[PDB]
């Protein structure tokens, strides 16, 4: 199979909200927690794309390795597969590439590609992919990078992991803009919002085009723009490093 890769920096998951009610609930939880509410709190609002999350490493501007999210802590080495994705640059353009930079984002299959692939499948006696999401995951997680080569995949960056030879801007949005400039792809629907009301609008606007843009949008990820606040706000951890459950082999049936 694929070589396993332990992410130097974790690939955390997200809590979900399925209503404005739960969303404000989330906001309030933050306000209280924050030492002093800046008023009115700015969120970097970006669309959540339907696909597979991946981590790409750049060493002095050169794409050197990539992996799948895995369990969030260990993924699979899909470097070669990643190089086949056109919109993924092999070289960051800056003249001053950080020592090491880890770009994170969604790999996905737009409607046109998805539709074409499935047309081919059906007409050639092969189960079609249920959705662009699943199609993406399979197209990408290929032992033979040539197959991945022929699948229409696209990368939309949303974050950074390791980062050394740099002093990243203080705001997430500023960071995404930097990633753009150095040649990395990031969704253009990302906007800045002040206060729930404003965010909720973003939510509505995006939802009213979750499929109209040419690709699938799962929902919207809302993040506090100010990096300092992020550090302050913390991480809703779970599972200790000092312990572990060593489970017994499954119970067998009678007979």
Minimum distance, C-beta of residue 57 to a copy of itself, in the bound complex (Å): 20
Query: Which one, of 69, 29, 30, 26, lies nearest residue 51 by Cα?
Result: 69
14 is in an annotated binding site: yes
In the list ligand 3B9, a copy of itself, none, the entry touching 103 (Cβ below 5 to 8 angstroms by class) is none
Strand partners, 42: 194
For residues 107 and 60, what is the distance between their CA atoms, to the nearest angstrom? 23
Among the listed residues 89, 241, 239, the one whose alpha carbon sits nearest the alpha carbon of residue 157: 89
User: Least distance to ligand 3B9 from the beta carbon of 114, Å?
Assistant: 18
Number of residues in contact with a copy of itself under rule CB under 8 A = 46
From the list 2, 26, 80, 178, which residue makes contact with a copy of itself (rule: CB under 8 A)? 26
Q: Is 161 helix (H, G, I), strand (E, B) or coil?
A: strand
Q: Which residue, 2 or 23, has its beta carbon nearer to a copy of itself?
A: 23
- Residues in 56-115 that interact with ligand 3B9 by CB under 6 A: 106
* Residue corresponding to tokens 């980062």: 163
Closest CA to 48 of 94, 77, 93, 17: 17
Give the residue, chosen from 4, 6, 12, 169, that forms a contact with ligand 3B9 under the rule CB under 6 A.
12
48 is catalytic: yes
**Residue 127 binds a copy of itself (CB under 8 A):** no
Q: Scanning the structure block, which residue is given the tokens 């119970």?
A: 251
Nearest 5°: phi and psi at 32? -50, -55
Nearest of 5, 43, 40, 56 to residue 173 by alpha carbon: 43
Q: 55 forms bridges with which residues in the sheet?
A: 67, 104
The label of the residue with tokens 């203080």 reads: 170
Q: Does 136 bind ligand 3B9 (CB under 6 A)?
A: no
Q: Is the dihedral of CA 147, 142, 98, 182 positive or negative?
A: positive
- Return the residues of window 203-222 that contact a copy of itself according to CB under 8 A: 203, 207, 210, 217-222
Binder among 5, 11, 45, 66 for ligand 3B9 (CB under 6 A): 11
Q: Which of 8, 43, 32 is nearest to 171 (CA)?
A: 43
Which residues define the annotated binding site for NAD(+)?
13-14, 46, 69, 106, 223, 247
Please give the residue ranges that form the binding site for a copy of itself (CB under 8 A): 10, 12-18, 23, 26, 29-30, 33, 48, 72-73, 203, 207, 210, 217-224, 229-230, 233-249
Please give the residue ranges that form the binding site for ligand 3B9 (CB under 6 A): 9-12, 14, 46, 48, 53, 106, 158-159, 221, 223, 235, 237, 240, 243
Q: Which residues are catalytic?
A: 48
């Amino acid at each position: 199979g694929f070589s396993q890769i332990r992410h130097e920096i974790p690939m955390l998951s997200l809590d979900n909200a399925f209503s404005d009610a739960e969303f404000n609930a989330f906001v309030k939880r933050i306000e209280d927690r924050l030492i002093l509410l800046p008023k009115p709190l700015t969120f970097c609002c970006e669309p959540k794309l339907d696909g597979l999350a991946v981590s790409i490493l750049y060493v002095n501007g050169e794409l050197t390795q990539a992996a799948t999210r895995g369990d969030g802590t260990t993924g699979e080495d899909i470097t070669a597969n990643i190089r086949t994705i056109r919109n993924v640059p092999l070289q960051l353009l800056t003249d001053n590439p950080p020592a090491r930079l880890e770009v994170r984002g969604e790999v996905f299959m737009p409607h046109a590609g998805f539709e074409r692939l499935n047309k081919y499948a059906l007409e050639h006696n092969e189960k079609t992919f249920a959705n662009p999401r699943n199609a993406a995951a399979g197209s990408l997680r290929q032992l033979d990078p040539n197959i991945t080569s022929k699948r229409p995949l696209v990368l939309n960056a949303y974050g950074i992991g390791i980062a050394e030879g740099v002093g990243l801007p203080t705001t997430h949005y500023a960071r995404l803009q930097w990633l753009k400039s150095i040649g990395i792809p990031v969704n253009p629907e990302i906007r800045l919002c002040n206060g729930a009301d404003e965010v909720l609008d973003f939510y509505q606007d995006i939802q009213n085009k979750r499929s109209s843009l040419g690709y699938d949008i799962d929902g919207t990820v809302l993040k506090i723009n100010d990096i300092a606040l992020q550090n302050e706000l913390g991480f809703i951890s779970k599972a200790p490093r000092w312990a572990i459950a060593y489970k017994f082999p499954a119970q067998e049936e009678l007979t």
